[model samples]
Target: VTSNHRASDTVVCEGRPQVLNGRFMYGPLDVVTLTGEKVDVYVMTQPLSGKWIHFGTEVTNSSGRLTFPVPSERALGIGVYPVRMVVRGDHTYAECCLTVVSRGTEAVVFSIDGSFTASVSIMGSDPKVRAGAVDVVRHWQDSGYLIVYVTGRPDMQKHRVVAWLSQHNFPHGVVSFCDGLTHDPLRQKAMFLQSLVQEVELNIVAGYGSPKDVAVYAALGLSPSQTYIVGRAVRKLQAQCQFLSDGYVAHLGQLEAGSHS
Candidate 1:
């Protein structure tokens, strides 16, 4: 697996959410275009409001990538903000989002890779969303739980990952990406949650992940019942998490039947 190769023309935007009052650092976005090509960026005034205010304009640099900060004047409060980047030359565009959160938020953390994805995905192919995954996520969202998506994938895949969630109609929530490729992705996952707990004072009430994620959730003090694992049941970790051996369909039934109510 060579690290030097670059994929062809696609906009890879990170869906980064900032704490209220923090200057926007959403995306050091990557776009493929001829040098000096004109591009426009815009952000919606609010989610589902259908009002997109211009954010910025820039010429694609020699490397075909450009990034700029959205000034503080356009600061967002606690909510989901959608953003889009369009290449003027061909009208090619990509859409991503920014979620602004505040302290003491109550959240349910989900590990995207194994919890929601049904199969492995390579560099270009899209991973299949696990059956009933979207409905289960929506259940929690409707129940007033903030949905937080976390992945061990490198930061470069943020665009693809966010697109996947959007493509599958997953509920909008905060998403976390690693700082590029790393040797210890699990530690990265742990640190991200730890910061949300200690610094943001986020109360992570429940977690959904794979068996390997047991320790990460356990470390956050989520009890076995609150920690749901999908995939083959790991015998030894049975005490650490509830395994969804029958997949999400039955699990959703359990939740809807007032198991977690």
Candidate 2:
């Protein structure tokens, strides 16, 4: 089904963090180009805001990418705001969540392709949601942890991937994608997390991913107990993270039992 939309237009407005009183950068937004089509910006002012109001619009340049700063007065308070963009030409649209976080906010990071999908071959097919993955994520959300989803997938597929998450009823979170297509996505993933830790000063309380993400968590100074990897145990990497050999259902039980506290 994912392939059905392959020829459709794609739009990306990456989630970004804005400290109180600091400027908000919406995107180096990516989209398909048609020299002068207008893209409308519709924004929900806050988490509980009733509806999206027309914010403004931008004309697509030759590159089909642009970035805009949120006006100081319109910059929201401490909460996540949903922003949607619509193309007047085709009615195609996309959305991203923007978080206004304070310095010490705590969060849990999830590697979308690695931890949530049940697919045997990710490259060849649309991924299926692994059993109990949604519940596991919701548990943390109820526990007051901010959810951060990181995927090595290119920004070009952001619209499709974001749709997949929504289609499956996954809780809202800040989603990030690699800039364009790249061969070294792992390194880019590491760099993005580093910026969140170092610059945003966000406390990454825990991380969930496959064994391939062990190094990414370790680089952020997370202890083995804080790093969760799903799937079969990797013997050599056994000591590097908490392995979820039985998947999210059993793992959720452990967290609820206070092991994560």
Candidate 3:
């Protein structure tokens, strides 16, 4: 993952670092290129908007990555925060986000490709999110449950995926992407969710994704009732998970009130 500049490389800061008080409560600067140089990482505060708060500067490891903490200060509350990295000599930067979820917060896990948009053929050029998908996620967020958006896509698409989420006005949560291109992305998702539940003491009240994601949810000990899948109903898959075949509109309606619990 060698690169000449920081902008060209993807520095994915993946993990749902929760907040019991006012801080990142897991962590990463998992990058794929441009290692051994000092990288300036900063946090964007929503205090007034576009508020760039210097997080701290650290040298990258051999992995072209660096792990550090996002300070918990009196100025901020428990919420989602974006992290960015810029090499000393480079003007352009790479970015990713992590959540500062409140302690004991239950979250709804989502597979970006499966749960949100349904672009069967074209991948990047056309990412059409399912209708009412934003509201479905927003609904959980509004009900006070945190949202976690994951994707099989590589870290290189962080900006694109994040932009898509922003373009649709999706509610905030930690967004996780594959290291690059991986043969077993579902495993990564499973491992990530495991860390959240076991390591961070977070709970998964519910989950939404395509049929392929059923195993991912089940691996986390999510039952059929709480496991929701998008797309057409398959009898076999249906037995293992609930289907959102009626699209997000009807699924949003069927979503029980326990999401906030």
The candidates, ranked best first by lDDT, are 2, 1, 3
TM-score, model 1 to reference:
0.70
Better of 2 and 3 by lDDT: 2
Better of 1 and 3 by TM-score: 3
What candidate 2 gets wrong by more than 4 Å, as runs, is 1-32, 35-38, 46-49, 88-92, 119-124
**Model 2 lDDT tens row, 1-261:** 011111111111223433211011123333334445676776787557578877667665555554445655566666667666676766666566667777678999998875788852264335778998999999999999988899888766666787889899999887777765465777878888888887777889999998778888988899998988876756765678888887889888988897853
The runs of at least 3 residues in candidate 1 whose Cα sits more than 4 Å from the true structure, single-residue gaps closed, are 1-42, 54-74, 84-95, 119-124
After superposition, candidate 3 runs with Cα above 4 Å error: 1-32, 44-46, 70-77, 119-122, 256-261
Q: Per-prediction count of colliding residue pairs?
A: 0, 0, 1
**Consecutive 10-residue window with the lowest summed lDDT within model 3:** 18-27
Could you tell me the lDDT of residue 91 within candidate 2? 66
Best by lDDT: 2
RMSD of each: 6.9, 6.0, 6.5
CA lDDT scores, all candidates in order: 0.69, 0.69, 0.65
**Candidate scoring better on TM-score of 1 and 2:** 2
Q: Write the per-residue lDDT of candidate 3 for residues 115-163, one digit (tens) a residue.
A: 6776433466447777888888888888777678878876655666777
Instruction: Give RMSD (Å) of candidate 1 vs. truth.
Output: 6.9
